[PDB]
Amino acid sequence: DWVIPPISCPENEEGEFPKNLVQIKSNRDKETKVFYSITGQGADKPPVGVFIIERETGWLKVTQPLDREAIAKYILYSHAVSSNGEAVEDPMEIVITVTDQNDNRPEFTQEVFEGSVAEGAVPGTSVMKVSATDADDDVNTYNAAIAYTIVSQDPELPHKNMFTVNRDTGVISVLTSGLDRESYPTYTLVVQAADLQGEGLSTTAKAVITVKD
Amino acid sequence: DWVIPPISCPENEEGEFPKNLVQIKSNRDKETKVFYSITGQGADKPPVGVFIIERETGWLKVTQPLDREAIAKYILYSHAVSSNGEAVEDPMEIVITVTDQNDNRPEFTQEVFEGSVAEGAVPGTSVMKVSATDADDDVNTYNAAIAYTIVSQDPELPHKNMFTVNRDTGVISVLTSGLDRESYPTYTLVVQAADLQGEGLSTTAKAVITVKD
Ligand SMILES: [Ca+2]
Ligand SMILES: [Ca+2]
Ligand SMILES: [Ca+2]
Numbered sequence: 473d474w475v476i477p478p479i480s481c482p483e484n485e486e487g488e489f490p491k492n493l494v495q496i497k498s499n500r501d502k503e504t505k506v507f508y509s510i511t512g513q514g515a516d517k518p519p520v521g522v523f524i525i526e527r528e529t530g531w532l533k534v535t536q537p538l539d540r541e542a543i544a545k546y547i548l549y550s551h552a553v554s555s556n557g558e559a560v561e562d563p564m565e566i567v568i569t570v571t572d573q574n575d576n577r578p579e580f581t582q583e584v585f586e587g588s589v590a591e592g593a594v595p596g597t598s599v600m601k602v603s604a605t606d607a608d609d610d611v612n613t614y615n616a617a618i619a620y621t622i623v624s625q626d627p628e629l630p631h632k633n634m635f636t637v638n639r640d641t642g643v644i645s646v647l648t649s650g651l652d653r654e655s656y657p658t659y660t661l662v663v664q665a666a667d668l669q670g671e672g673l674s675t676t677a678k679a680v681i682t683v684k685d
Numbered sequence: 686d687w688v689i690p691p692i693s694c695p696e697n698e699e700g701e702f703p704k705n706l707v708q709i710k711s712n713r714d715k716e717t718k719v720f721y722s723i724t725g726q727g728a729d730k731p732p733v734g735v736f737i738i739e740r741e742t743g744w745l746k747v748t749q750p751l752d753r754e755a756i757a758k759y760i761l762y763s764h765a766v767s768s769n770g771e772a773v774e775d776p777m778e779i780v781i782t783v784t785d786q787n788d789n790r791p792e793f794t795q796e797v798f799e800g801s802v803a804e805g806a807v808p809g810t811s812v813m814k815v816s817a818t819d820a821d822d823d824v825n826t827y828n829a830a831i832a833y834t835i836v837s838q839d840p841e842l843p844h845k846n847m848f849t850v851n852r853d854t855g856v857i858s859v860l861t862s863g864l865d866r867e868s869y870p871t872y873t874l875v876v877q878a879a880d881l882q883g884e885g886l887s888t889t890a891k892a893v894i895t896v897k898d
């Protein structure tokens with residue numbers, strides 16, 4: 473069957489407010505003068521006044537930019553009251569969904585990750601995992617699709633690239649041979665996480681790897 | 686009962702196109718992949734491509750600025766077809782109404798109106814009528830609500846204001862005494878018509894009045 477989807481409104485809208493969303497209507501507006509109102513969170517309950525309805529025309533409007541990450545869905549109820557003061561409809565549920573924009577940058581779950589690896593570990597050996605989260609919409613967009621990279625390694629010995637990271641999982645592995653605890657007991661890697669599959673907003677953190685016997 | 690009003694779109698919209706109007710949906714999109722299309726005048730029939738629908742999301746959009754005075758109402762039908770090629774809904778009627786903007790100036794139905802009046806006619810005597818039309822929406826707005834005025838009179842004798850016009854009807858009447866055929870056999874009046882009850886767009890024409898015995 474054909475059905476009516478929730479009203480959709482993108483977050484972070486700019487320009488002239490308020491903005492029309494949709495017109496609601498009671499077909500009793502034929503017999504009497506009808507006045508429309510809305511109730512619910514976002515209307516008369518917190519956050520108050522985010523949405524309003526024009527009492528005589530039935531035009532539902534949004535008055536401010538929205539934030540999906542604050543509230544992703546609103547449930548309101550419309551009311552219809554004649555000029556003589558009687559409700560001429562049962563209140564009608566109205567659903568509004570807020571659509572996503574890429575406005576949150578990824579964040580590593582810690583500033584410094586620690587791991588260790590045996591000096592004799594064969595190339596390919598998994599050492600540790602770095603992890604980042606992204607508040608944007610991972611279900612319907614790539615705004616939270618994170619790619620992990622290694623930005624730098626200190627020291628750059630015995631080779632510049634002793635390790636590699638899984639672009640999707642943040643698991644760091646031994647890339648080449650030569651780890652040597654006596655010479656270089658510790659490595660500090662700067663790792664990067666970036667959304668839009670690596671092309672978007674980005675953040676960095678450190679991974680400190682202790683070489684063991 | 687609560688009912689669904691036609692989609693409303695203001696004429697002469699500016700900025701980024703296309704613009705979203707509303708999202709339609711088949712709840713069979715649960716069982717199979719659904720592809721949406723629209724037919725009708727404004728879609729696949731002239732004017733072609735004014736409205737389109739995004740095949741996978743169901744978002745109906747308008748691609749150009751509209752002109753209420755060209756077309757004030759569109760009737761389209763939406764279709765729903767599975768990826769395997771069967772229609773999964775009966776086509777649904779979709780109505781779009783175009784809302785008015787004050788973009789037509791009034792026009793007198795002729796460039797020169799002619800009338801005559803007996804020189805002895807008492808003040809108040811109705812002489813002639815000027816008439817203007819306005820293509821904008823006279824039902825729902827004041828965009829075609831015309832006010833008539835007299836801009837000038839030639840000659841300005843025996844008095845500057847021998848006549849007056851009904852602001853609403855354009856009927857011109859004798860305002861004062863002194864008309865005298867031998868002295869001033871003819872008057873040329875410039876009359877004005879302006880919408881928004883006199884405050885809006887305006888045009889002028891002439892009224893030529895012959896004084897009779
Ligand atoms: Ca946000
Ligand atoms: Ca993001
Ligand atoms: Ca977001």
Ligand SMILES: [Ca+2]
Binds near residue numbers: 696752754
């Ligand atoms: Ca127009």
Ligand SMILES: [Ca+2]
Binds near residue numbers: 787
């Ligand atoms: Ca007009």
Ligand SMILES: [Ca+2]
Binds near residue numbers: 785787
């Ligand atoms: Ca118009």
